[PDB]
Structure formats: structure tokens, C-alpha cells
Amino acid sequence: QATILKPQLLPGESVAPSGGRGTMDPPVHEICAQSIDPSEGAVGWFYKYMDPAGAVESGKALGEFSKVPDGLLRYSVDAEQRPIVTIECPTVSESDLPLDGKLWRVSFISFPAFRLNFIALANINNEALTLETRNTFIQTLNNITNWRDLGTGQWAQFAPGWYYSIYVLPNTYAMAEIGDRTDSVTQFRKVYKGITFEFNAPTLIDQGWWVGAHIPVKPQSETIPAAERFSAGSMTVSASNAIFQPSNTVARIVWSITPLPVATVALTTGTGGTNNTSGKFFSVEIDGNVNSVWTFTAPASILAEGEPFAEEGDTTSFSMTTITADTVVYSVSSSLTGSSVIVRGVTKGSGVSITPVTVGIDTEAVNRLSIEMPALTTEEVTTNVPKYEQFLCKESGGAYIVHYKMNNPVFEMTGEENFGGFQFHYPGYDPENNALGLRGIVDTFENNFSSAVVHFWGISQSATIVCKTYDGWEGTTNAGSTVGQFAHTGAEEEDEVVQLANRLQMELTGVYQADDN
């Protein structure tokens, strides 16, 4: 064992009294062996890449473990985000008995994405997912508009007994995608990513089991056109139900509009109950009864069903004529005289009602990422994946998942190339139900790492899941980067190890128990 120190001046370099570089490659404390001498970062990384969560509390973590030891980057910033989320049933399913032996299903999709952690959707009833059930789900994640306003980890209904939420990574997510203040870095790599899905259940009714399995997915940049004078858009009205109030009376539709600018929707005529986004595009969260009517000044011209509907200075008024305990009829109304009203049939907790709109707004082009939603099937995973593991939640105090450089044999640098609006496709799934404009999740997807899911099944309303995640990303900062000030030399190539790792990983199942954490 010993420490190494490289010079600012390369053998012979003759710098002035203030020239050179401004950095000083932090010393090399590479440990020694009969055949290799990996640096604590190289080493720590190995363990971290292998048993992220464990290796840390295992004491084996150390040095620049958030950096990959394949001496590729001349300089790179890096770190780990260990966000810990507590997933737990969405419906406050009121029971009268002292023992509401209710159970619920829940599943998580992990995407080695820059800002995104993982996705999750549960079913209050332990019912499995139906095709159309599943589909709505999907088409929802594609239709999510101002997605950023969801990272709060908040639960969201999309189906009847189904809700779903998305969890970002505290900081990377804390890096905006607007031209003003925050823009990502030139690129990166998912240095290693693991998650423990602690089975937090009353050691009374610890029933339940879960299946985990890694599935690789590569995105497809099915890009959106850059429009000029006018732009095509989609008016979305996903009808839903008031988590508490009477279906046959009140509805809870989410109403957004693809390329139209975010404009405050205040309920004017009706009873009340709205919650508008803050995203760049126009979307709304509102619950109410029939008579009720929300309003807002249309930021820009809007066409529809051919004939123009609104103009910059117009005022759109959205209401709902009928509210069956499950279906919903609504109306959209323009100031602009000569325009006609818009109406459409939806079905709360079901697919969205689309309305090929057109917005008089210049439209920046941005790709949408066609990503195959990993086997979400109670038992599909179980089939297309042999390296999947599974035990009861009781035994495996939860699930431990370790992603890995799945797609590329080596560690490329997933950069801006595959960045954009996540839009998940799947079998049996119809895209016609896919919303237009730049909506859905938006992030740089580490095309190298293994995507992966884990469904929990047969657990208790009482049992909750603490998802301790350890995300290790490394990338190169460019400008305005609120991080560039942390980058140093990139890990040195100690492939010796690296390979080993790769073997293990390959040799291994990226799934384990929250007791092997």
C-alpha cells in the first residue's frame, strides 16, 4: 500500500509564475496486492457498483466510489444520491372491522435515468393489472404533462383501484431543464445504482412476497417537430374520481394541453376545487361537480376540430355536463365569438380524451423517447427473465436490487443523445392513446445500465415500503453547471477489477433480499 502524486508540470513542462492548470489531481491512495493496486475509489466503486447499499454500511465503500475506474474521462464530476422514499398504499380504504385484512399490490420500475429514480404503481385491491388496466397506466405516464410537478413523490390515480407516483433523485432533479438558469451536463454514466425495498410491515401481518428482475431497455428518440407560426397539440382530459367524494356526483379530471402555455385556471362559476401546475405547458388538477366551471385566459391562439377556438386574449371555460359514477362529459368554451363549444366523452379512471389542438405558438423541437415499459406483468417478468429472484416480503425483509452496465459491454457516456420525453410502449398497447406535445417524463437515460422492476404482491395496507436507493452517477459538466465546481480527474482505469465486477454482475442476478441488503 502507498500514496501517489502526479506533478502539475509534465516532465519538462516549463510554466510561468501563474500558468499551468488550476487543479491538482487529488493524490492516489491506491491499495496494493500481489498483482494489482486499485485506488480506494476504484475499490470502493467496485463494492458500490456491486453491493451499493451494503458496501457502504459494509464499510467496504471508499474513495471516489461514485466514479468509474476505467480511466476514460480526463475530468469528471460524480456522486451518489441516496434518496429514501416510503411507498405505501394510496387509498385510505376505510374498514369497520378491527382487522381490515386488506392487501394491496404495488410495483416499481427502475430506470437508470439521470433525474429519475424509479416509478411505482399500486392497486389498493390486491388485484393484478389488466391489459386495458395496464394500458391506461402506460398512456398516463406518456400523457403526464408538466411531469416535474409530480416528483414530490405524491400518489396519483390513473385507474380505479390504481394509483402511481414517480420519484426523482433529489438533486439531479433539482437541476432544471429551462434555458434561463439550469441545464444538465454534457453527459454521463450511471456508475452503479441499487435500491433496497425494505418491507416495513407490522411483524404481525407480514404476509406478502415480491419478485425482482433486471430488464435492459434502450430508448428510441421518436422526436417532435420544431413548429413555427402554429404548432400541433393535444388537449388532455383524463377523467378521474375524487379519492373521497361521490363518484355519481363529483369527478376529478386532470386537464392539460400539450403545447399551450401554462396559464392559471381559477374556478369561477362552480363549487370549487382546483390545483394548477407550474410547468411550462398548461395543465390543471381539478375536482368538482357538474355546474362548476373553471376559467383562464388562453395564452395563445387555439384551433380544434378545424375551426379556430381561441386567441391570445380569449378566455377558455371548462365544465362538465354529466358525471356518472364512472363516465364524464365535459365542455370547453371560448370567448372568441363565432367559435363553437367543445364536448367529449371520457371515463374517469380510464383512458384520456384527446382533442387534436393547434396552438399559435412557436414550437421548439424536442425528442420523445420510445421506451419499452419493462415487464410489468404479475407473471411476465417471471417468464422473460431467468435471472429474477423472489421471496416473501416476510423472509426477505424487502428487496435489494443492483443495476449494472447491461447494454454496453463497456461504460460509454450516455449523453444528451438519448434525452427527452419518456413515452412507454408495450405489447397490446395502442399508441393512438398517446398525447402529442412534449409531455411525460423528461430525462437523460443511461443507455448503458440495466433497467429493472420489482412487483410486490399480497402485502398489507399497513405494510409500507421504505425504498433506500443509492444512485451513483458521474458525468462531465459544461457551463452554468451548478456542479462543475466539483469535478476532478476521472477515475483511473483499473479494468483488472472492473472486469471482475462485470463478471460477477453478469454471473449474478441483480436482485437480492433486503436482509442481504
Binding site: I36, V497, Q499, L500, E507, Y512, D516
Partner: protein, 67 residues
């Protein structure tokens, strides 16, 4: 076993320690580390317990201290 993983990987890295990292050897070392081949007591498993008896036991004991 808290970090049974890194522990596992830890051992394999260990071997790599001396073993001249020949992808050929590395292979063996990997294969080995998992426990697939060439293993000895350099192996371990489920140390914890299913509450069934963990619970039941401490229930059996409370007063049965006569022994």
C-alpha cells in the same frame, strides 16, 4: 447478511489480489467467488431467522428458566 453481496464480491476481489488478473483467471476467480466452483468454507448463508420461532421461542422462555 448485511452486505452479503460486497462480502461475496469482497472475497473474489481478495483472490484477484494475488492472482495475476488474466481474464482467464479472473473468470475462475469470478466463478469461484459466487461459490460456483473451487469453493471451501469460504462460504456463508442465512444467519437470520424466520420470526415464527424467533417469536415462539422468547415466548417459550419468559418463565421456563427452571433449567
Amino acid at each position: 447478511f448485511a452486505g452479503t453481496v460486497s462480502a461475496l464480491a469482497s472475497i473474489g476481489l481478495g483472490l484477484l489480489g494475488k492472482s495475476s488478473a488474466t481474464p482467464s483467471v479472473i473468470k475462475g476467480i469470478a466463478q469461484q467467488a459466487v461459490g460456483a466452483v473451487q469453493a471451501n468454507p469460504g462460504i456463508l448463508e442465512g444467519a437470520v431467522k424466520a420470526i415464527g420461532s424467533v417469536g415462539a421461542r422468547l415466548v417459550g422462555s419468559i418463565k421456563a428458566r427452571r433449567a
